[PDB]
């Protein structure tokens, strides 16, 4: 009966040895292909630390749970042995989950770099169009025109500011900055019907 309980244990050993090969680092190396500084580097550093905390909390203890399972089985402590394997699998479930959480955490960052640039491209174009609408239809706005020419000029430094924040790897401030800019350009454009 032990010989066929040993299969449960062997399946656990196969599972440990394969989850030791989850590409945590290949995942995180994707962040290096962006600007590895600022908030980006902070998140990269924090995730390396988590992997040490995860490795020691969830992976190191497994080996012993499996050794206890073998010893207990051998003495015919069948349920006790099964418990140690259940525990081992629970621990590996967490390690696996901590990987999944990092595919997701990094995907989020990739998505923000992409979406940050989408907004920036939109703001460049809108700026250009608004600046031209004023310079070519000055008369058509009446007296509210000089306030507009200077207010639209105030978007130009705010574009350059985005380039700086992005270049420093501050993807979060970059996003909040460019979203706010888009919002305000938007409301200024509604107003510009009249």
Residue numbers in the entry: 23 to 216
Question: What does the article say, verbatim?
Answer:
By contrast, the integral membrane protein EzrA was identified as an inhibitor of FtsZ polymerization and its absence results in the inappropriate formation of multiple FtsZ rings, not only at mid-cell but also at the cell poles. EzrA comprises a single, N-terminal trans-membrane (TM) spanning helix followed by an ~60-kDa cytoplasmic domain15, which sequence analysis suggests forms an α-helical coiled-coil. The BsEzrA22–562 and the shorter SaEzrA24–214 rods comprise multiple copies of the same ~100 amino acid, triple helical bundle; BsEzrA22–562 contains five such repeats and SaEzrA24–214 contains just two. Although many proteins are known to comprise bundles of antiparallel α-helices, EzrA is, to the best of our knowledge, the only bacterial protein that is formed from serial spectrin-like repeats.
A 190 residue N-terminal fragment of S. aureus EzrA, SaEzrA24–214 (that also lacks its N-terminal TM helix), yielded crystals that diffracted to 2.6 Å resolution. The structures of SaEzrA24–214 and BsEzrA22–562, which share only 20% sequence identity, superpose with root mean square deviations (RMSDs) of 2.4 Å on 154 paired Cα atoms. As also observed in several spectrins, the SaEzrA24–214 structure reveals intimate interactions at the interface between repeats involving the linker helix and loop residues. For example, the linker residues Tyr135 and Ile131 interact with loop residues Thr62, Leu56 and Tyr193. The angle between the two repeats in SaEzrA24–214 is 34°, suggesting that full-length EzrA from S. aureus will also have a pronounced bend. The first and third repeats in EzrA each contain a highly conserved proline residue in helix A; Pro45 of SaEzrA in repeat 1 is conserved in eight out of nine phylogenetically diverse paralogues, whereas Pro228 (Pro227 in BsEzrA) in repeat 3 is conserved in all of them. The conserved proline in helix 1 of repeat 1 (Pro45 in S. aureus EzrA) may confer some additional flexibility in the junction between the body of the cytoplasmic domain and the membrane.
